[PDB]
């Protein structure tokens, strides 16, 4: 039935509690049944959700929010537990602080005192800037204005944890096979979790916006990319509400057949996907190395820039792309950038146009450079051999002995990442030559993939010399949300995609990354003009774009065809943060037939006017709420 969602999801969460996880994977079954202060409305706008309204202070230091009355905390049987209140808001965060939280870069920098307390300097969390003023009255502080801080509330660490519960569980609390071990404010219970096999919601009855709720329950069965097939299938069977089509399937040219009036393609996504290099590999238990010498050669390989830039230009994206989109949809999909070039603007100019006023200084090969989304702007055969020639000169002067041979790890049960590896692979041997680079594909299983990649525990976990196992999307509407994460500092981060975990490692100062530091702090200062702001992190995504120290690829999601029963345009429209229809399921309709390309064409159109007024009318609302 159209009240019935049916579609998938590809890892079981570590732990469900969400304000300590940094990982889609917790969001993915939390979102739907845990509310923050704001949503996102389908044309984008922050819509009220446990803030029923909220002033800020002239000086844009104070935020105030008037909590929702009535809004109350279910178990995942739907009894009454508690009412909503500030003190959950105050409890999250000191709850986020005291363990940790994998997000706390959106958070320590900004909340005032927060940094001291995370320090122990301070012990006391009155020290820190959220406060119940009263019960419905929360307050933040803030270190410096932050024109983008309500949009941190639709990410998971600003969301609210009930103490007396939390208490209660002991260390039982949000273990991720336990629905009863959190409980839940939002549109829909958490009712199921079975490893390996399904995640399972119901619509919460007495939730206090049921009236923009209009699916019954939620059913998300596990998938491990085994049979890319499957999710086609499902949906012909009316089991899946959606469905991401393959076209190199081989039964492909008969999908298209049966479905070609209702194929349709999706915008790109903000996220990014591509290949991280490891500057400071420290654990050789997944490699085909069979030397020491073999072992220094390539982790003094990947410390030459020049090593690091003939890679990155070999990689045909394309072909990469064309590995899960086809040849013919291939270039949609395709990056060339770590922030999404038209992520922000300033005026006229996006914030890919600013990278590329900036990158020459760094080389002639970035005249010209062509950095927008949906076409291989940095592919080039004959610069990657020059760079190459360049870097082959300067490590065989120290010693290293050639080909440099790359581990770079995959999930046997993943047949299309695989082939983007092998992809992968192919360019750089095939451009390169395979007398000076080797792919070496380690092949194992999906925990094995997941404990060295996704789910790392820490830098001696992150064993691969390249990986392209994690992407990462935006948690806020500004460029530090992306470039703050590979900071030296942002031990969190920096293991997942560059494989390092200590600011103070001799490789991280080798590969110049306290420069990239010192323009991302350059750029974080600017709070006065915006248009600055964005081109002194253009400054910082120039530095990162040469350094090749993250190889971007595709975006991490949309550009692709697709199958929908789902209404076109119905449900939460999100460039960042955690309240995406992606995860997020409120105000999403479904409807019995198959979408057609021409229902979704027509209320792409009349969407786009009525989301330009509607997000027009909303920016010239918000100075009434500056008290």
């Excluded at 105030?64 to 109350?72: E, Q």
């Excluded at 903000?270 to 290949?275: D, E, Q, R, Y």
């Excluded at 002067?397 to 440099?404: E, H, K, S």
């Excluded at 293991?495 to 080798?510: A, E, H, I, M, R």
């Amino acid at each position: 039935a159209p009240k019935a969602y049916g579609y998938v999801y590809t890892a079981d969460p570590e732990t469900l509690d969400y304000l300590i996880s940094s990982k889609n994977s917790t969001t993915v079954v939390t979102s739907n049944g845990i509310d923050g202060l704001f949503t996102n409305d389908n044309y984008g706008n922050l819509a009220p959700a446990v803030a029923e309204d909220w002033e800020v202070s002239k000086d844009g230091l104070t935020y105030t929010y008037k909590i929702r009355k009535g809004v109350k905390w279910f178990t995942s049987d739907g009894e009454e537990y508690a009412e909503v209140t500030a003190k959950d808001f105050v409890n999250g965060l000191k709850h986020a602080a005291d363990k940790k939280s994998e997000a706390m870069y959106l958070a320590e920098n900004s909340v005032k005192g927060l940094a001291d307390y995370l320090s122990g300097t301070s012990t006391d969390f009155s020290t820190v800037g959220v406060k119940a003023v009263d019960d419905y009255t929360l307050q933040y502080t803030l270190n410096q204005p932050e024109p983008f801080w309500n949009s941190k509330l639709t990410y998971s660490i600003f969301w609210p944890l009930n103490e007396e519960f939390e208490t209660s569980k002991g260390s039982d609390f949000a273990k991720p096979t336990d629905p009863t071990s959190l409980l839940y404010n939002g549109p829909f219970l958490l009712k199921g979790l079975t490893a390996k096999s399904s995640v399972e919601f119901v619509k919460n009855e007495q939730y206090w916006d049921k009236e923009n709720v209009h699916l019954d329950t939620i059913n998300l069965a596990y998938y491990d990319g085994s049979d890319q097939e499957s999710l086609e299938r499902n949906f012909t069977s009316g089991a899946y509400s959606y469905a991401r089509l393959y076209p190199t399937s081989s039964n492909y040219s008969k999908v298209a057949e049966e479905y070609k009036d209702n194929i349709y393609y999706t915008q790109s996504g903000s996220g990014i996907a591509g290949l991280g290099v490891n500057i400071d590999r420290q654990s050789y238990n997944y490699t085909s190395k069979t030397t020491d010498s073999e072992k220094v050669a390539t982790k003094k390989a990947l410390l030459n820039k020049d090593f690091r830039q003939a890679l990155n230009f070999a990689l045909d994206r394309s072909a990469y792309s064309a590995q899960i989109n086809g040849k013919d949809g291939a270039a949609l999909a395709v990056r060339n950038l770590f922030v999404k070039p038209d992520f922000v603007s300033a005026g006229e100019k996006t914030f890919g146009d600013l990278v590329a006023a900036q990158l020459p200084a760094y080389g002639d090969e970035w005249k010209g450079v062509n950095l927008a989304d949906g076409q291989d702007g940095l592919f080039n055969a004959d610069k990657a051999k020059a760079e190459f020639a360049k870097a082959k000169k300067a490590l065989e002067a120290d010693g290293v002995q050639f080909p440099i041979h790359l581990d770079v790890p995959v999930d046997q049960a993943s047949k299309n990442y695989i082939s983007r590896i092998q992809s992968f692979k192919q360019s750089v041997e095939t451009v390169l030559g395979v007398e000076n680079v080797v792919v070496d594909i380690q092949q194992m299983t999906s925990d094995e993939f997941l404990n060295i990649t996704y789910y790392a525990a820490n830098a001696s976990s992150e064993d691969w010399d390249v990986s392209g196992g994690v992407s990462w999307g935006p948690d806020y509407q500004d460029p530090s949300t992306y470039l703050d994460i590979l900071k030296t500092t942002s031990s969190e981060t920096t293991k997942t995609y560059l494989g390092f975990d200590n600011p103070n490692s001799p490789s991280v100062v080798q590969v110049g990354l306290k420069e990239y530091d010192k323009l991302v702090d350059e750029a974080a200062r600017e709070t006065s003009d915006l248009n600055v702001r964005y081109e002194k992190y253009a400054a910082a995504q120039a530095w990162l774009t040469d350094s090749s120290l993250f190889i971007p690829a595709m975006a991490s999601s949309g550009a692709a065809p697709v199958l929908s029963r789902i209404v076109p345009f119905t449900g939460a429209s999100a460039q960042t943060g955690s309240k995406g229809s992606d995860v997020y399921f409120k105000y999403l309709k479904s409807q019995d037939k198959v979408v057609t390309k021409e229902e979704y064409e027509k209320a792409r159109e009349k969407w786009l006017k009525e989301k330009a007024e509607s997000n027009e009318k909303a920016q010239k609302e918000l100075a009434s709420h500056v008290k």
